[PDB]
Each structure stands twice: as C-alpha cells, then as structure tokens.
C-alpha cells in the first residue's frame, strides 16, 4: 500500500500565474507508474499526465509533470480560468491503484459584491402548511459572506440553512442561498421578513426585506 499525499490541499491563484502541485510517495515509485488526473465539477477524473512527464492526448502544453523516486510535481505554466479543478496524483504497483487526496485549485479574481434577492414563500407552498423564504446572494467573490435573518427586527437563529455553489465557470464567482423555513402558522404571525448581507465587496451591508 503506497500512500500518496499532495500539497497544498487548496491552492488559490490568479489566471496567468504558475501553479506547482506536489505529490510525495511513502516509498519510491518508478516514474513510469505515476500519473496525474484533473477533475472538474460534476465530472469524472480525466487523465492529464501519464508516466510522470507525458501529456495525455489533447492536454495543452501548459501542463507538464516532472519528478522521480519519491517527489513528483505537476506544473501549470500559465493558468487559464478553465483550469479550476481538483488535481490528483495516482500510482499503480501492478495490482493496485492508489490516488492522492487531491489539490483543489481555486481561481483568484477581483473582488465582486453580491447581488441580493429575496423571495417570499409561494402561495402554493403556503397552502401545504410550510413557508420557505429564500435569500439569494449571486455572483460574489471572495467566498466568505455573512447573511442575517431578521423577522419583525428579531434576529433569527437555527431556523435557516445556507447552501453555497462552486466557483462559477464563466466568472469564478460564488453564489449562496439562505433559506428560512417556517410553518404556515408561524409565518402568518409576522409581517417584515428581512435578509441582511455583509461582504467585503459591499460599501455597507445590504438588506432585502418584504412585508407579507
């Protein structure tokens, strides 16, 4: 059992820079038996480098691999935005294939403030006894964002759930949903539902609210 371990775990670089990804093996690996794979969101891993330094068919020349023995290196000499992915090294000892845990490559980007939208529950959902209020933070960067629910100015806890999208292929931004779920009876007891958003791209915090 040869354990492969990659460094760093997460890499954040701007397009046009050189990325250098490490794979170090627990014991010596014949260079013929070490490969690199690229995995983009929602897709299977794809062969990038085989035999330590050979480019698979169709792989661009900016990807190259080097190394021997215990230390192997994947280099992307000038990052393109589409290079956002997880990169794995892989070894084969004739009978078993093992992979590293992978290096996640984030594409660094100018700060982008979020667009904030709020959606009251649909009339259809409310007729079923449930009220889901959705606050949408769209196309922002960096990833970190703070969302705060106020109901009739009462700060809310433990009744909302956030979901965050992966870095968008077109613009390297993130998007986030915060969903406040109440019973229909709980929802109708109040008037003002407000979503408050804090993010470094915004001059001052942004509140989106509605009256029932």
């Amino acid at each position: 059992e040869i354990v492969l371990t990659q460094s760093p775990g997460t890499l954040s670089l701007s397009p046009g820079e050189r990325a250098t990804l490490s794979c170090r093996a627990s014991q010596s690996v014949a260079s013929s038996y070490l490969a690199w794979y690229q995995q983009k969101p929602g897709q299977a891993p794809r062969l990038l480098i085989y035999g330590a330094s050979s480019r698979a068919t169709g792989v661009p020349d900016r990807f190259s691999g080097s190394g021997s023995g215990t230390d192997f290196i994947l280099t992307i000499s000038r990052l393109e935005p589409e290079d956002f992915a997880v990169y794995y090294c892989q070894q084969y000892d004739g009978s078993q294939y093992t992979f590293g845990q992978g290096t996640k490559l984030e594409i660094k980007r100018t700060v982008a403030a979020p667009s904030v939208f709020i959606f009251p529950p649909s009339d259809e959902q409310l007729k079923s006894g449930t009220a889901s209020v959705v606050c949408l933070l769209n196309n922002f960067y960096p990833r970190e964002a703070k969302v705060q629910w106020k109901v009739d100015n009462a700060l809310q806890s433990g009744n909302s759930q956030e979901s965050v999208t992966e870095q968008d292929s077109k613009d390297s931004t993130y998007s986030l949903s915060s969903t406040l779920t109440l019973s229909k009876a709980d929802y109708e007891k109040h008037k003002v539902y407000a979503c408050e958003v804090t993010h470094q791209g915004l001059s001052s915090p942004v509140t989106k609210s509605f009256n029932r």
Partner: protein, 228 residues
Amino acid sequence: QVQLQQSGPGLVKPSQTLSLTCVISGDTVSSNRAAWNWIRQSPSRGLEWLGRTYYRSKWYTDYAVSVKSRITITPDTSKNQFSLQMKSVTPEDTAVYYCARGSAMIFGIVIILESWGQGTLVTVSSASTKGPSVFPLAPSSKSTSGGTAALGCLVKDYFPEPVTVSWNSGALTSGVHTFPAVLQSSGLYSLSSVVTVPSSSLGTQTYICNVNHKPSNTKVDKKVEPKS
C-alpha cells in the same frame, strides 16, 4: 471512441447488496487490450480503486484489499457490459461509483485508467424514496437589482439525491445556479435552482424549470410566472 454508460442513481438499504452495471460502446468487454475497473469517490474514502476484471484467454480479476472479500466484478459478453456487486453495504459505502477502462499506454506494461463513466451516486440508507415538490421562486420588485431580475424553483422534500434541474428544456443555460442540496431536519433533501434574466423580459418570455428526480422517476415542469 469508447463510451461507458452506468446505471442510474440508486438507493441501497444497509447490510444489503449494491449492484451497478457499466455498458461499453466503442470497445468489446472481452478485449485482450483492456481491463475493466471500478472506482468510487466519497469524503471518507477519497478516490478509491475497487477492482477490475479482464480477459486474456480466460477471465481474471483483481480486487483492492479494502473490499477484497465483499465485491465481485462480472463481465457479460452477451451484452458487452461488466457489473459490480458489493455485499453488506454500510453508510461508508455511500459514494459516487465510476467504471473505467484500463489500457496499456507505456510500452505494453503500464495499465492506465484512461476512459471513465460519468459516475453513479449510491446512497446507503434505510429511508424510502420520495419525489420532490417543486415550487416557484417568482420574480418581483424584491428580486430585482438594477435591470436584472432573479427567479427560480425550490425543489423540496425529496430522497435520495440527486435531482437535476434544467431551464426551458436546456435552452436557457446562462446565469443558472443550482445549489447543492441540504438535508432537512425531516431527513429529506431540498435545493433551489435560480437564474437571472432581463427584467424587461418578464412580460413576454416564458421561463420553465424542468425537474428530474430519477430515483422516483419524477419529471416536473414548473412555469415560473412573475408576481408583483
């Protein structure tokens, strides 16, 4: 031009047997140049190779030590396919499972995983399948920002993962964000799919989200009309 088609997303009860099939187009399963592999991916297993089968005047198999006593991999020449069976599944067997072809790429010796199926999510759970409710996220003055208007669909209370959401039968793709599902306190998943469109288009253009929950064979088309 090999094309690997895997069975659909599935639910398997704990302690029962996982079963998946990979149908091969563009190659033959009995090829003496290929090996046919299974791999899985999850947070706790990482990217984990499971085993392979291949033909060389007779059928051979190799299994990973981690699962060697629990899996078989059986080829089917009559349908040009190979299958993975895994007995006594536990929650740690929840993963995306991939089939993959191994080919000798470095002088006849190095067998490299060079063609992969799209992946099948298998959820190990005792809970029952439930199709989703689809509700509109209607555009309004509260979901505008300049000339841009946001709208979406809330896909709620389904099990298991995954659902797929398209817009206008795949014709509308720009500016679409379908969020990762969250598991609700009820044990059912929920997600929203949103899209941003010109606010001037809300009176003339039609926006429909097309929701597909293959585990329940639920297809739902939801016309999202503006509300103000």
